[PDB]
Amino acid sequence: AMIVDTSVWIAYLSTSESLASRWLADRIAADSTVIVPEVVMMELLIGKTDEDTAALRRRLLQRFAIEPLAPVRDAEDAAAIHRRCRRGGDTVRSLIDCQVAAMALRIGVAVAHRDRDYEAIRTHCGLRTEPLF
Amino acid sequence: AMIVDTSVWIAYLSTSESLASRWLADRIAADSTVIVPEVVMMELLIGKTDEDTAALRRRLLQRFAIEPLAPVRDAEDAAAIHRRCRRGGDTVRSLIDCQVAAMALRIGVAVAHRDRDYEAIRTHCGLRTEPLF
Amino acid sequence: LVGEPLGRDEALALQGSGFDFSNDEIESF
Amino acid sequence: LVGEPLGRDEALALQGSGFDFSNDEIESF
Ligand SMILES: [Mg+2]
Ligand SMILES: [Mg+2]
Ligand SMILES: [Mn+2]
Ligand SMILES: [Mn+2]
What we know:
The PDB classes it as toxin/antitoxin. Chain A is 57% helix and 12% strand. With 133 residues, chain A is α/β, with parallel strands linked by helices. The longest helix of chain A has 15 residues, at 73-87. Chain C is 31% helix and 0% strand. One manganese (II) ion binds next to loops of chain A.
């Protein structure tokens, strides 16, 4: 049971071959459990303006567990994570990453990603990661 | 009863002379209803790293109505808003702006702001705004 | 409206179907 | 932990108290 960050889904959907893309293809082929934070779903649904593509990708993500954020609490924690990292010298580049981390730490799973932001969060908050650069 | 975007709160906290800052000060002085989306709260809470300043700003926003997003639905709508705007030739710079707009359209309020992203959303989706440049 | 969840092979077929933004761009337009 | 909501004068006293980022910066770090 793990969270797959937007960055890996983008690698998968992009026309380029990469380890992240191969990793997600394998995981999809194995019927492994993928956790989809709603904010990741949101990011993925803007990659193409075509509404039929969006609808098809909405069904792609619906195959897995679309996990809802905890109201108010995940947002507060996301901000606390961002502050903590910034005191430690790292400015996390997206609050969405922080919300994803807030969820991961709350439910106790790792985050698969191709985004150094999560390695910063790992350093300061201990977030379990599977980096896929 | 309206949503006050992060941009106005930032103006309020940054100077005492801008239109946006003065507008919010007046609204606060009049005890008017300010709707604070949790994502706006989140953005505001990262502006200072000191936990005591953060706690104080947390209490500032608690004076008003903190409104949680509608789980999944606001995020879907936010992405739909982003796609519609982009088809219209406007790339909205923040998905958080789109979540705020999705909430506003859902509960039927206007958004007070100093961010041209919302005038883009107004153009393509009709969102009521009070621009404060 | 949300359609029916994709099947395994349906999901696999969308690999490489395209994305307009890199992740870095997604995080800052 | 969430402290007591600020009173009106307390809230007004925070005008101009500082913010490390412009709105542009907060939307693109
Ligand atoms: Mg991200
Ligand atoms: Mg914004
Ligand atoms: Mn990031
Ligand atoms: Mn914006």
